[PDB]
Design an enzyme around this catalytic site. Structure first.
Site, PDB file in Angstrom:
ATOM      1  N   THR E  30       0.870  -1.327  -0.220  1.00 60.65           N
ATOM      2  CA  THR E  30      -0.010   0.049   0.075  1.00 60.65           C
ATOM      3  C   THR E  30       0.878   1.323  -0.071  1.00 60.65           C
ATOM      4  OG1 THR E  30      -0.190   0.004   2.577  1.00 60.65           O
ATOM      5  CG2 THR E  30      -1.831  -1.126   1.343  1.00 60.65           C
ATOM      6  N   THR E  31       0.169   2.559  -0.377  1.00 58.84           N
ATOM      7  CA  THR E  31       0.760   3.839  -0.528  1.00 58.84           C
ATOM      8  C   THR E  31       1.293   4.205   0.861  1.00 58.84           C
ATOM      9  OG1 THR E  31      -0.210   3.914  -2.539  1.00 58.84           O
ATOM     10  CG2 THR E  31       1.325   5.770  -1.738  1.00 58.84           C
TER      11      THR E  31
END
Ligand SMILES: [Cl-]
Lengths: 111, 241, 244, 240, 243, 222, 250, 231, 235
Positions: E30-31
């Site tokens: 995920t970012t």
């Protein structure tokens, strides 16, 4: 030179009846000629209908009671919640005490 | 062919892992250069900051090992910093054990010995770096000593390292053929830095702004790096001649 | 991990052989031949140096024949460097026994312990075995003169006459032919040299390509003497038997 | 330390290193054990491709572990020395703590345990050796003969053989040995042992070794002439 | 070939393929971002809501080291926790010996050397995380990003994970439009916007926003989580910008 | 095996209706030499606990660092570090008690006598003692060193048993503590006039008072 | 973590070869030529100084090294391997001899210790053999002058004269024609320079050639006076100028 | 394929196959369910037998008076990890006189599993765990995976056909979360949840295993005739 | 090659699965539990007639109240039995009581997975552990090299296990007497054994509260074999 032992005084007493047993102890805690506490209990319910007291040097007494209480806990974990009989508790406490044969717990123990 | 995976000999007596560690040296695509003056030793290296999000002040391949010794690395930064931390620790221990500052050449030998061990012992890989150590030694004077993944080391009159190293090397060779001496016959370190940048410009064929370069200077009793404005001051002096 | 690069030096083949031991014996078969012959009044040790160069210093050289103590010597066939590791261990072991019991070590005991070390390298540790075969020549007051051999497997056996290294098959046949039990040392010297002269891969056997030694009771009264032959002494013994 | 698991299971549930160690035993010279009414006899083959041997000093095939127990083997000779040494040390250790020499069963159980340990320990290969262990328990006159193998299993035998061509001599013993009536005397037991080896050996010259163990630490090895008399007697009865 | 089967092996290029393979695990994650500001740093991360059954606000991903450093990472979450546990040990021994709390550059190299050590042997695996971290020390604010190879630099803004390129582009605009500097409270709002914009690269599952910050003025130089009114304010700012 | 070098004298304390009070002087003695005068021997942990330490000062400073580190460690991966999972006085005490008894058992003690005073999350008063031997005990009043001999008798006149605690206000309690400190200055040869006092109340929280002085002394009868 | 390579990396192949030792010898073959000649009153060891770059200072790289005051060493093969072997060789001369007997080891025994170290790299876990051949020249009271060769296997041989490396085959043949048992030290130096010119291609002078002798004691190189028994080192490295003087009368 | 020989090796797409194969052992395991309200937390587990002559493999283990878990996969690995939890809960009590937070319990399990995925020689744990507990911040439910990933949830399920119960709980979320001060109803919801993972078999008296912990309820396990109430 | 502690793609440990194949090659062992006791029986399977069958020891005492039968690589069982005996006696020393059968089994099963790169491989032997204690009464456990153990009313292990287990499924009920169980083990052993069953190639044993663990004599088993043959002919 550092002395690792002390004397916290007090006295304890155990009597057994036909279908019961008592374990009594005074609540006074001392060092030398001073009172540390007027109410410091040293008789404990350890579970499985076993009461215990380790009178003498309180630090060793608390350490022992603490270790036995823990021994009861692990006895349940390892043996399917089986009740620890008083005779089995006694033998277990012998090994706790003798394990420090060359640096003893300075206590007289009664259960 | 597992003789190409660990540091054991191939049938032709070669160590491929050592050879491939040499190729990792150029992974950063940066060229470095080192020269000696009368009183000083100057080292310069290219500084390429491609990402706009980077903090340019933290991007560096020159290291201050001790008060007197500086080191520039050609190779990936993780291995570079690994070598730097070890060199710093070794230099500190030497001073504590033997009561005097570790010479540049002795540190070079020590780091070269460590590198040699990785070429012989299987569980440790070589570091993909070439280490150029610079100082003004209290016995030997201005000094340049360089280490590689094979564990080889030697002193230099001057040297260069990187992808376009050969162009820089011959450029320097041709100057020392002409001057007939072992160093840059110059009083101040400022003009030795100017010489270093000038001859790098000629060899590479590129112009440099203040942020395209990185400069380290060694004098008696201290090694220090230059700021962007120190280099800019130096670039202006070259342009006005 | 590192499993990938493990040769597994201490395993069995499907046929029940130890790969590395077999291959070590194959190495030893290319080493210079060494012969041991046991007589009733002494022991001979003879060995052929590996293809010599004329600029090799011959007198101050030792390749084949080594002294373990005053009563025991060995002839080497295989890697010299490997043999010296084992020789120094054997020398120390002999001194340990002497220190403990105040008596010189019996030959077999020394041989067994050295052979037990070789055995260990074939069963555990994951290391290559020692590429060495020894001929032990020695004397003690229990069994008198004794010849033994040990090889990389750590197996040892006793002999009246034996060869190790190159051309053992041909050498053993020749020894089996001319050897007899009532033989003397001087006769055994001649047999040793004659055998090497016929089994050699060289054109002609000369003094500079040989190491020689005897273990006699030819000292003065009831005591044993080790004689490691000098170059000139090998030259003389080679003429005396009419080989050159 | 070298840790590699050399003895491991294969898809079919076999431990090949243990099984290949059995092949080393199959290569070794034949060894046979026969127990009579009042004795045990250990017979051993010696290959005759080795002339110019010195039989005075060459390691004997049958080894004394204590004054009352003996051990013979088939397989790798160098491996057997390690087992024999350990057994000899345990024999003295048992006398020291229990104040009584080992039983043959106990000594066998120990040796077998050592062999088993080398089949599931890291960095080691199994012993390429099977043993025949024979003797008499302290203050007992009942003969004992046990066998061990590389895997570590052990068991008691009325008569047994191991080594090369052991299946041939086992065949012989299976029809020639009566459980109801074992060899009543020493002579009968030695003869049956020599007979069984003569099915496999070659010549009855310096190829057969015989060792007789009797109760109360009475162990002796037969000489060439003594054995040769059994060989001469058996062949004359055969021509019939 | 086979050069990629073992860690610490150089390929004929001079590359360690095992480290490059660990980078693929980071790109899959995920970012997460980091924004450097006037007197501190701001960290933010995307938390994918896999199910309704996830308890909101109760699966915290940003981690504190000492009392002044914050750490966030993308990739294998357990690997990141291992790195922070080491970071906490490193910071503790520094403060034990030298009294002062560990400086951010000093802390950055402690992680760098430790991660680099996991590229030296075939008996260990490289870290499957890129870690964004930083804080405030005696010399002011610092933001760092550390990769599986052990490589790290200082950053004005940093991003990693599945939406790193989207986030990088958005970060570059802030650097260009604010040469004098960005404030702490502004950076919190911008951090929210960038996570929402970077969520376009992971838009199947909807997500939960998580922000933290260190600031000399706003948090007194200590690491704190952004919660309640300040968080909702930052969410609303981000919601208004996507529409 | 140790011997204490730089030392701190009495620490005194008591319970009252809503919380606990604890006090200790600001002196670091070097034998008979009254060497250091700016020594703080009360160390707060959070906003609900104060640890008072007497004995060796080098060991006191070590214990400071441990408590400081305990706060840091408790905050790690703990969203409720300033709420339900904040450090309780009982947690802090048991930790110290464990350390003290372990060190005595290794024959290398921390040469201290410690009193942990605080208020639990449920409002209950906490006051417990531990020393170099690992000995622990609790009482309505607790004091170390000379305090045990001279302060306890005075403080016990106010709170003699458990039932006297609800009947004792913070004004009455602080008055008794401040009086006890004066008596110690009269009679303890290693006391100083300057001291610190801390109140931990279940309503008003932690109040830490520095640079207090003993005053209203009687000498004129000399 | 930890060195999991506890097993041998050099093993016997079916043909009986030890691959890694053979391959190490191949690396020595590629190496620059070095030689040694023994005279009646001394020993000479020599080699070419192959410069990696003209910017490099070849004086800082020493191929000929002092091990003890009366023992020197030169090599052919991998330089880094040689450097660490010299470090270990110097130390072992002290730890396993001088610190016990209060005197320096004789040539043969120091050689034996170096040979042991190189043998262990052939059998120990997780290591390759050393990729060098050494030539060790030295003097001691009871053995006089001596010259030894040490190979990657750990084997060592005493030589009257020999050469190793690139052009060793031709160089050995050259030495066979010129060597006799009556050579004086100066005659041996002359032959060493002649032999080396054949294998060297580029410049041939005192700056490209490295040459040292084991000869007479040098009291001037001792550094102190007052002890009669201490007379100075027999090892001496010839200067660049001293080499050029002999190249004129060549 | 070529990258699944050990845990120390990454695949070209950045996968750890040994960890994934360990995850596969959980999928083969018997279904177990976890759910909680604000007052109580409940574990329900379907036990599995070898045949009709055998006992039913116990799925639920007690860790402390206030904490315990259910298992799915390699049972010996659950014994190792539960034993570690017992020790950690116990260390917290003896040293700090403090009941171990359910969240810290999760963090500790994560870090223990992780170390086995980054070193040569070892292997990942081959079991999944559902940890329930009641501490100072109320009731809790955790899901442990041997990759190292630990997750706090209102409800969940692991094992074979766990997707059925997981979907049901996802629908029932609003209902069962507000079952406060009523143990029997929270169990009923969990028993109905696990029933969505049954095929051909139904819940019998020696098949079902239930555990509960809460505000005024120590961690206790129910088996045999004590679960007949819920069938 | 490959790691010893490696997982297969199906989520099983290769070495554990391979050791289970070794156990299938082993000789048959059967156990039946009743309210009057637990019976343990094994196939001896001598490899040759010259081998003295009474030396084949595949049924073994752990304590007075616990017995054990084995199948597979039986040499591997020695250290398992040694551990079991020590565990049983040690518990009596620490607690002045008999150790529970389940607790004993768990202690043995803890050894199982202590292998890798600890011992070099799993055990190649399965155990049937039978005993009695005051809490749970008569019990039978099947202990595998996977570290897993199941309690059983009845269980067969070894080469004839799947056929014998199907037979035990039909025959077992909760009211079996000890005598009925003895005959049932003999009956099922005779069915799956290669050679004809007699007192020399098969062995019986039991554990009761009153008399503890007892291995039967060859004379006692021979009569039970004769009693079994007569009863099958009687209908
Ligand atoms: Cl070094």
């Amino acid at each position: 030179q550092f002395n690792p032992y002390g004397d916290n005084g007090g006295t304890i007493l155990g009597i057994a009846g036909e279908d019961f047993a008592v374990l009594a102890g005074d609540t006074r805690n001392i060092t030398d000629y001073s009172i540390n506490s007027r109410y410091e209990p040293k008789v404990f319910d350890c579970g499985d209908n076993i009461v215990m007291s380790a009178n003498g040097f309180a630090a060793d007494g608390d350490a022992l009671v603490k270790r036995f209480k823990n021994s009861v806990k692990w006895y349940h974990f390892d043996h399917n919640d089986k009740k620890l009989s008083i005779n089995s508790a006694a033998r277990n406490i012998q090994h706790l005490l003798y394990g420090k044969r060359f640096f003893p717990y300075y206590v007289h123990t009664i259960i | 062919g597992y003789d190409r995976h660990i540091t054991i000999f191939s049938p032709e007596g070669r160590l491929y892992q050592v050879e491939y560690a040499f190729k990792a040296t150029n992974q950063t695509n940066i060229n470095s250069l080192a020269v000696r003056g009368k009183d000083c030793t100057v080292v310069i290296s290219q500084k390429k900051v491609p990402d706009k999000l980077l903090d340019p002040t933290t991007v560096s391949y020159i290291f201050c090992i001790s008060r007197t010794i500086g080191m520039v690395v050609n190779g990936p930064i993780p291995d570079a910093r690994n070598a730097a931390l070890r060199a710093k620790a070794e230099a500190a221990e030497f001073r504590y054990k033997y009561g005097y500052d570790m010479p540049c050449d002795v540190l070079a030998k020590r780091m070269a010995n460590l590198s040699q061990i990785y070429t012989q012992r299987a569980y440790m890989r070589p570091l993909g770096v070439i280490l150029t150590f610079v100082s003004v030694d209290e016995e030997l004077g201005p000094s340049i000593y360089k280490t590689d993944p094979a564990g080889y080391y030697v002193g230099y009159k001057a040297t260069a390292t990187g992808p376009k190293q050969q162009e820089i090397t011959t450029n320097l060779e041709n100057h020392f053929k002409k001057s007939k001496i072992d160093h840059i016959n110059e009083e101040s370190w400022e003009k030795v830095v100017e010489f270093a940048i000038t001859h790098m410009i000629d060899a590479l064929g590129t112009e440099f702004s203040k942020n395209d370069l990185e400069v380290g200077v060694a004098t008696k009793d201290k090694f220090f790096t230059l700021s962007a404005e120190n280099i800019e001051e130096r670039l202006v002096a070259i342009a006005e001649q | 991990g590192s499993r990938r690069y493990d040769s597994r030096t201490t395993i069995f083949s499907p046929e029940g052989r130890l790969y590395q031991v077999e291959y070590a014996l194959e190495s030893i078969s290319h080493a210079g031949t060494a012969i041991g012959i046991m007589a009733s009044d002494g022991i001979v040790l003879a060995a052929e140096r590996k293809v010599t160069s004329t600029l090799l210093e011959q007198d101050t050289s030792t390749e084949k024949l080594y002294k373990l103590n005053d009563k025991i010597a060995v002839a080497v066939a295989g890697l010299t460097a490997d043999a010296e590791i084992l020789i120094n261990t054997a020398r120390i072991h002999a001194q340990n026994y002497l220190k403990t019991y105040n008596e010189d070590i019996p030959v077999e005991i020394l041989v067994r312990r050295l052979s037990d070390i070789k055995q260990g390298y074939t069963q555990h540790g994951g290391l290559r075995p020692f590429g060495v075969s020894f001929i032990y020549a020695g004397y003690d007051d229990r069994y008198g003169y004794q010849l033994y051999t040990s090889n990389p497997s750590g197996n040892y056996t006793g002999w009246k006459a034996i060869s190790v290294g190159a051309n053992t098959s041909a050498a053993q046949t020749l020894l089996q032919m001319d050897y007899k039990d009532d033989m003397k040392v001087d006769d055994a010297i001649e047999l040793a040299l004659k055998t090497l002269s016929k089994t050699t891969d060289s054109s002609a056997l000369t003094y500079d390509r040989l190491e020689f030694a005897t273990i006699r009771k030819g000292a003065n009264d009831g005591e044993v003497y080790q004689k490691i032959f000098k170059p000139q002494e090998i030259k003389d013994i080679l003429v005396k038997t009419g080989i050159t | 330390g070298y840790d590699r698991a050399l003895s491991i299971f294969s898809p079919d549930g076999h431990i090949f290193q243990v099984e290949y160690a059995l092949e080393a035993v199959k290569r070794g010279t034949c060894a046979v054990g026969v127990k009579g009414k009042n004795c045990v006899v250990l017979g051993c083959e010696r290959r005759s491709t080795l002339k110019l041997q010195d039989t005075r000093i060459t390691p004997s095939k049958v080894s004394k572990i204590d004054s009352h127990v003996v051990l013979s083997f088939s397989g790798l000779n160098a491996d057997s020395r390690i087992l024999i040494e350990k057994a000899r040390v345990e024999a003295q250790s048992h006398r020291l703590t229990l104040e009584d020499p080992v039983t043959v069963e106990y000594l066998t159980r120990y040796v077998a345990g050592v062999q088993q340990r080398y089949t599931q320990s890291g960095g080691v290969r199994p012993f390429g050796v099977s043993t025949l262990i024979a003797g008499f328990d302290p203050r007992d006159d009942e003969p004992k003969l046990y066998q061990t193998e590389p895997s570590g299993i052990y068991s008691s035998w009325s008569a047994q053989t191991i080594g090369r061509n052991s299946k041939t001599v086992r065949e012989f013993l299976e029809k020639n040995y009566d459980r109801k009536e074992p060899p009543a005397t020493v002579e009968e037991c030695v003869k049956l042992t020599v007979r069984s080896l003569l099915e496999v050996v070659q010549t009855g010259a310096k190829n057969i070794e015989i060792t007789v163990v009797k109760p109360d630490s009475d162990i002796v090895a037969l000489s060439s002439e003594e054995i040769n008399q059994y060989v001469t007697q058996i062949e004359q009865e055969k021509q019939e | 070939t086979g050069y990629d089967l073992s860690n610490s092996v150089f390929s004929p290029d001079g590359r360690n393929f095992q480290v490059e393979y660990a980078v693929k695990a980071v790109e899959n994650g995920t970012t997460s971002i980091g924004i450097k500001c006037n007197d501190g740093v701001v960290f933010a991360v995307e938390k994918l809501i896999t199910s309704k059954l996830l308890v909101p606000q109760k699966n915290v991903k940003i981690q504190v080291v000492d009392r002044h450093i914050g750490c966030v990472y993308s990739g294998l979450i357990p690997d990141g926790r291992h790195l922070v546990n080491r970071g906490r040990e490193e910071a503790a021994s520094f403060k034990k010996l030298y009294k002062t709390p560990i400086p951010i550059p000093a802390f950055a190299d402690r992680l760098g050397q430790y991660v680099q050590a996991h590229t030296l042997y075939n008996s260990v695996r490289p870290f499957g995380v890129s870690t964004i971290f930083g804080g405030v020390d005696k010399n002011g604010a610092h933001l760092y990003m550390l990769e599986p190879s052990g490589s790290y630099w200082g950053y004005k803004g940093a991003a990693t994970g599945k939406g790193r390129q989207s986030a990088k582009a958005e970060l570059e605009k802030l650097v260009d439009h604010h040469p004098e500097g960005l404030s702490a409270r502004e950076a919190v709002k911008q951090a929210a916007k960038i996570i929402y914009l970077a969520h376009e690269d992971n838009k199947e599952k909807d997500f939960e926003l998580e922000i933290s910050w260190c600031s000399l003025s706003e948090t007194n130089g200590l690491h704190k989580f952004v919660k309640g009114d300040l968080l909702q304010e930052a969410i609303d700012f981000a919601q208004k910008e996507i529409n | 095996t140790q011997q204490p070098i730089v030392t701190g004298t009495s620490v005194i304390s008591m319970k009252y209706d809503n919380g606990v009070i604890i006090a200790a002087d600001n002196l670091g003695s070097y034998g008979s030499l009254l060497r250091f005068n700016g020594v703080e021997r009360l160390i707060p942990v959070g906003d609900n606990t104060v640890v008072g330490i007497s004995g060796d000062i080098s060991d006191m400073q070590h214990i400071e660092r441990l408590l400081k580190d305990l706060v840091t460690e408790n905050a790690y991966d703990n969203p409720l570090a300033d709420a339900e999972e904040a450090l309780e006085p009982s947690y802090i005490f048991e930790y110290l008690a464990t350390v003290m008894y372990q060190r005595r058992s290794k024959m290398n003690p921390l040469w201290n006598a410690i009193i942990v005073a605080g208020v639990q999350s449920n409002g209950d008063q906490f006051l417990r003692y531990v020393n170099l031997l690992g000995v622990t005990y609790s009482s309505p009043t607790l004091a170390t060193g000379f305090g045990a001999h001279m302060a306890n008798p005075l403080l016990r006149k106010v709170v003699d048993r458990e039932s006297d605690i609800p009947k004792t206000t913070v004004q009455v309690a602080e008055e008794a503590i401040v009086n006890a400190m004066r008596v110690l200055y009269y009679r303890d040869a290693r006391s100083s006039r300057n001291f610190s006092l801390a109140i931990i109340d279940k309503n008003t929280g932690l109040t830490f008072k520095k640079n207090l002085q003993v005053e209203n002394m009687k000498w004129d009868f000399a | 973590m930890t060195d999991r390579y506890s097993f041998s990396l050099t093993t016997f192949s079916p043909s009986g070869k030890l691959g890694q030792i053979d391959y190490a010898l191949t690396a020595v073959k590629q190496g620059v030529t070095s030689l040694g000649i023994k005279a009646t009153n001394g020993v000479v060891i020599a080699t070419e100084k192959k410069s990696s770059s003209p910017l490099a200072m070849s004086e800082t790289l020493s191929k000929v090294s002092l091990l003890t005051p009366d023992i020197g060493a030169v090599y052919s093969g991998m330089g880094p391997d040689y450097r660490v072997l010299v470090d270990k060789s110097r130390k072992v001369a002290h730890t396993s001899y001088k610190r016990i007997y209060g005197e320096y080891p004789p040539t043969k025994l120091l050689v034996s210790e170096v040979a042991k170290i190189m043998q262990e790299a052939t059998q120990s876990g997780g290591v390759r053999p050393f990729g060098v051949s050494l030539l060790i020249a030295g003097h001691d009271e009871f053995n006089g002058f001596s010259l030894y060769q040490v190979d990657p296997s750990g084997s060592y041989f005493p030589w009257k004269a020999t050469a190793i490396g690139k052009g060793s085959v031709a160089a050995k043949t050259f030495l066979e024609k010129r060597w006799n048992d009556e050579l004086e030290l100066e005659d041996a130096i002359h032959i060493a320079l002649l032999t080396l010119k054949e294998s060297v291609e580029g410049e041939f002078n005192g700056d490209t050639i490295e040459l040292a002798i084991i000869g007479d004691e040098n009291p001037d190189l001792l550094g102190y006076t007052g002890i009669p028994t201490d007379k100075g080192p027999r090892f001496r490295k010839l200067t660049s100028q001293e080499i050029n003087d002999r190249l004129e009368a060549l | 394929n070529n990258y699944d020989g050990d845990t120390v090796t990454f695949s070209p797409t950045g996968r750890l196959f040994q960890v994934e194969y360990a995850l596969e052992a959980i999928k083969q395991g018997s279904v177990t369910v976890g759910l909680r309200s604000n007052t109580h937390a409940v574990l329900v587990a379907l036990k599995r037998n070898a045949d009709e002559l055998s006992s039913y493999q116990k799925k639920i283990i007690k860790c402390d008076e206030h904490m315990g878990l259910s298992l799915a996969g390699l049972a010996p690995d659950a014994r190792v990890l539960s034993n570690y939890l017992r020790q950690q809960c116990n260390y917290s009590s003896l040293v700090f006189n403090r009941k171990l937070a359910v969240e810290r319990a999760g963090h500790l399990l994560c870090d223990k599993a992780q170390k086995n995925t980054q070193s040569y020689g070892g292997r990942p744990y081959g079991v999944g765990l559902l940890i329930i507990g009641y501490d100072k911040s109320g009731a809790h439910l955790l899901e442990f995976q041997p990759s190292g990933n630990v997750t706090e949830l209102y409800g969940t399920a692991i094992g074979a056909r766990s997707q059925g119960a997981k979907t049901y709980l996802e629908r029932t979320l609003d209902t069962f979360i507000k079952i406060d001060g009523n143990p029997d109803e929270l169990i009923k919801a969990g028993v109905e949840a696990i029933s969505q993972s049954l095929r051909d078999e139904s819940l019998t008296v020696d098949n079902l295993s239930i555990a509960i912990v809460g505000k005024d309820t120590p961690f206790t396990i129910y088996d045999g005739e004590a679960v007949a109430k819920y069938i | 090659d490959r790691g010893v502690s490696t997982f297969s793609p199906e989520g099983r440990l290769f070495q554990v699965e391979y050791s289970l194949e070794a156990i299938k090659l082993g000789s048959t062992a059967i156990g039946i539990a009743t309210k009057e006791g637990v019976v343990l029986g094994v196939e001896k399977r001598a490899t040759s007639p010259l081998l003295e069958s009474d030396s084949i020891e595949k049924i073994v005492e752990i304590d007075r109240h616990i017995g054990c039968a084995m199948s597979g690589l039986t040499a591997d069982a020695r250290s398992m039995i040694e551990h079991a005996r020590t565990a049983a006696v040690t518990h009596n020393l620490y607690y002045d009581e008999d150790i529970n059968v389940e607790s004993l089994t768990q202690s043995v099963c803890d050894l199982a997975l202590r292998f890798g790169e600890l011992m070099s491989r799993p055990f190649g032997v399965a155990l049937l552990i039978a005993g009695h204690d005051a809490d749970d009464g008569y019990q039978l456990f099947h202990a595998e090299p996977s570290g897993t153990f199941y309690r059983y009313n009845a269980k067969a292990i070894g080469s004839g296990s799947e056929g014998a287990q199907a037979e035990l499924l039909n025959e077992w009920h909760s009211s079996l007497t000890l005598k009925e169980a003895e005959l049932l083990v003999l009956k099922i052993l005779k069915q799956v054994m290669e050679e004809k069953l007699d007192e020399n190639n098969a062995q019986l044993s039991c554990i009761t509260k009153q008399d503890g663990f007892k291995i039967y004599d060859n004379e006692k088993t021979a009569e039970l074999i004769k009693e079994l043959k007569e009863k099958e002919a009687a209908e």
